[PDB]
């Protein structure tokens, strides 16, 4: 067995700067650690093998260094094409043990996100369900609070929420929240509201919408 | 033309069998050091197997946690490799990826997976398949989309208009439910000067199960 820890784990820096990545071994792999870049949806590419070693092709802005247990990843100025996820792998000896790998992203200006709300269809409420969808789009930073008010009586273990991925256009987020309920517990109610709650924005964003109205 | 081609996965019972096929041409097959790697969205890339030619040494290694039930094989006439997995459990699970080492001998300088396949993904589940119920979310700008809900296994894919709508289309990842079962949300912000005049058709397409399902949105 042989270890290796990967450090950090998600990182955020801006076009032009400079970013250093850590990859750590349980052992002297001596020089046969290789990294990879993995791009949403696509395979994995090699970077840099031997540890300092760069491929044909890969630009000179990768350089690899260190010896024995430390080893680092160095990207001088980021250009936009570098935000993925980054993995190194030790060849020392099988098996080809791999590194947890560092998600990176890109970081523009805050951006304060617009928000939609959206209530249950009538063909969604011929079948006994209702979900209830609030939409967050083109913010920044990815942390955001999203709250649910039914009657403004906060709300706790019905809604789930998923963000995309780190947009190409501008670098931007995207969240939607959806408030599932039952159809009964649905026509009980009346006042559903979604809060959010944003660096960008400075007051507490709230969007309802009246079942009756 | 150096290029890898994976198939054979889909959704399997727990403890079934499955047979990951990895196809090869552009480079002369029967030398080539070929390994197996799965990807899930928890642990990341994870090392499987590896199968080399013509070594008298082990030739076949395994990572430790696939011993026993899964096994590589290769045949030279067929310029293929394959993984046949067996007592399949919910580990399992992930996209599979076939790639070439740059090792020619047994301690060859110069280490890495320089050629990878698109990868072929894997679910292993009880869970039976099931098409996907679609549902309307309708409304400077405005905003509209679909909730595709209630789908197994993944993936469902979604477009708009037939491939029409490109600017502002957000679809985001599939969530797994209490249910067990995933929906999905995609939405598309269209300048509010084009609501109802310009008809927004939702298509969705499950192939798992067979499903191709198309839903208006009108506000
Ligand atoms: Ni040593
Ligand atoms: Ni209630």
């Known amino acids: 067995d042989i270890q290796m820890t990967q450090s950090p784990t998600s990182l955020s820096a801006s076009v032009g700067e400079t970013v250093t990545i850590t990859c750590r071994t349980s052992?002297?792999?001596?020089?046969?650690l290789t990294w990879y870049q993995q791009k949403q949806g696509k395979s994995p590419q090699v970077l840099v093998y031997?540890?300092?070693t760069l491929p044909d092709g890969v630009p000179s802005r990768f350089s690899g260094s260190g010896s024995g247990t430390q080893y680092s990843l160095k990207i001088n100025s980021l250009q936009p094409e570098d935000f993925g996820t980054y993995y190194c792998?030790?060849?020392?000896?099988?098996?080809?043990?791999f590194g947890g790998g560092t998600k990176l992203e890109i970081k523009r200006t805050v951006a304060a996100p617009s928000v939609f709300i959206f209530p249950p269809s009538d063909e969604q409420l011929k079948s006994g369900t209702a979900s209830v969808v609030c939409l967050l789009n083109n913010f920044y930073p990815r942390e955001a609070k999203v709250q649910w008010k039914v009657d403004n009586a906060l709300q706790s273990g019905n809604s789930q929420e998923s963000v995309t991925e780190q947009d190409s256009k501008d670098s931007t987020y995207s969240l939607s929240s959806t408030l599932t309920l039952s159809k009964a517990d649905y026509e009980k109610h009346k006042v559903y509201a979604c809060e959010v709650t944003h660096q960008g924005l400075s007051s507490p964003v709230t969007k309802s919408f009246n079942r009756g109205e | 033309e150096v290029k890898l081609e994976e198939s054979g996965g889909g959704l399997v019972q727990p403890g079934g069998s499955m047979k990951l096929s990895c196809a090869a041409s552009?480079?002369?097959?029967?030398?080539?050091?070929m390994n197996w790697v799965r990807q899930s969205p928890e642990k990341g890339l994870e090392w499987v197997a590896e199968?080399?030619?013509?070594?008298?040494?082990?030739?076949?290694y395994y990572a430790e946690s696939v011993k026993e039930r899964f096994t590589i094989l290769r045949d030279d006439s067929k310029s293929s490799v394959y993984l046949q997995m067996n007592s399949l459990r919910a580990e399992d699970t992930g996209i599979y990826y076939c790639?070439?080492?740059?090792?020619?001998?047994?301690?060859?300088?110069?280490?890495?997976?320089?050629?990878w396949g698109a990868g072929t993904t894997v679910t292993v589940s009880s869970a039976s398949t099931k098409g996907p119920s679609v549902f309307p979310l309708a409304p400077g700008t405005a905003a509209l989309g679909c909730l595709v809900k209630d789908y197994f296994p993944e993936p469902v894919t979604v477009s708009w208009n037939s491939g029409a709508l490109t600017s502002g289309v957000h679809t985001f990842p599939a969530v797994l439910q209490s249910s067990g079962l995933y929906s999905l949300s995609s939405v598309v912000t269209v300048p509010s000067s084009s609501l109802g005049t310009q008809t927004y058709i939702c298509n969705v397409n499950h192939k798992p199960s067979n499903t191709k399902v198309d839903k208006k949105v009108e506000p």
């Open positions: 790639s070439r080492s740059t090792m020619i001998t047994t301690r060859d300088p110069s280490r890495y997976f320089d050629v």
């Open positions: 552009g480079f002369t097959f029967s030398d080539a050091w």
């Open positions: 199968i080399r030619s013509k070594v008298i040494n082990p030739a076949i």
């Open positions: 052992e002297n792999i001596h020089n046969f």
């Open positions: 031997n540890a300092k």
């Open positions: 792998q030790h060849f020392w000896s099988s098996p080809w043990t």
